[PDB]
Design a protein around this ligand. Sequence first.
Ligand code: HEC
Ligand code: HEC
Ligand code: HEC
Ligand code: HEC
Length: 107
Amino acid sequence: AEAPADGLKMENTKMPVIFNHSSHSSYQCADCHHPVDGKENLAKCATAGCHDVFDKKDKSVHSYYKIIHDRKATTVATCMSCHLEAAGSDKDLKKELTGCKKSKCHP
Ligand code: HEC
Ligand code: HEC
Ligand code: HEC
Ligand code: HEC
């Protein structure tokens, strides 16, 4: 399958984020779109039954907050766990890629 155009709005919450596939083109699709039940899975992450729990305190597999923001990941990277690695030690990359506000995720 082909990646969609840039400018995709992630908007399940009051803190929506613009996702650009072009900034992630060197990663395999399945690094984010993990298979489910042995089948390709390009479904929206917060689809009912999937990552559909919006309580920030929830740490279950169904937590939408966790799949995006958890600082550590084992099986499937989170946005944050990968951006923490990518930013490394420098202040600017941390600001742009990992910050809660004034970052490229949450301007
Ligand atoms: C990109 C790597 C992100 C960084 C860095 C941070 N957040 Fe985030 N956040 C991100 C996404 C993709 C989303 C979902 C967008 C949508 O609307 O679907 C969010 C959303 C939130 C929310 C809203 C959650 C809710 O109300 O259910 C909050 C409160 C939030 N983000 C907080 C937050 C904090 C505290 C961060 C620093 C540790 C932070 N975000 C960084 C992506 C990214
Ligand atoms: C993580 C770094 C990703 C990589 C690598 C790829 N995609 Fe992606 N994609 C990602 C997110 C966070 C989203 C938004 C999902 C949401 O629920 O908001 C998407 C979206 C898509 C879509 C559209 C889904 C829809 O609107 O129905 C498609 C078709 C898609 N992605 C395909 C795709 C392919 C083929 C990729 C490899 C070339 C690929 N994505 C990489 C995150 C990530
Ligand atoms: C339902 C059919 C799902 C959709 C759509 C998405 N995910 Fe998922 N995810 C689902 C299950 C049943 C699991 C358990 C373990 C497994 O890998 O099968 C997961 C796991 C993850 C994880 C790791 C655990 C966690 O943090 O909850 C991550 C980081 C994750 N999934 C992210 C993710 C993203 C970014 C998705 C949209 C692009 C997405 N998942 C879709 C079920 C389902
Ligand atoms: C590694 C496996 C990653 C995962 C998972 C996610 N991102 Fe990412 N992202 C990654 C790198 C190495 C970079 C720098 C490349 C660049 O062009 O700057 C990025 C960049 C972003 C950005 C800034 C650029 C832009 O497109 O505006 C944003 C806003 C961003 N990434 C968001 C984002 C979200 C919401 C993710 C989870 C759904 C996510 N990234 C995952 C590496 C990786």
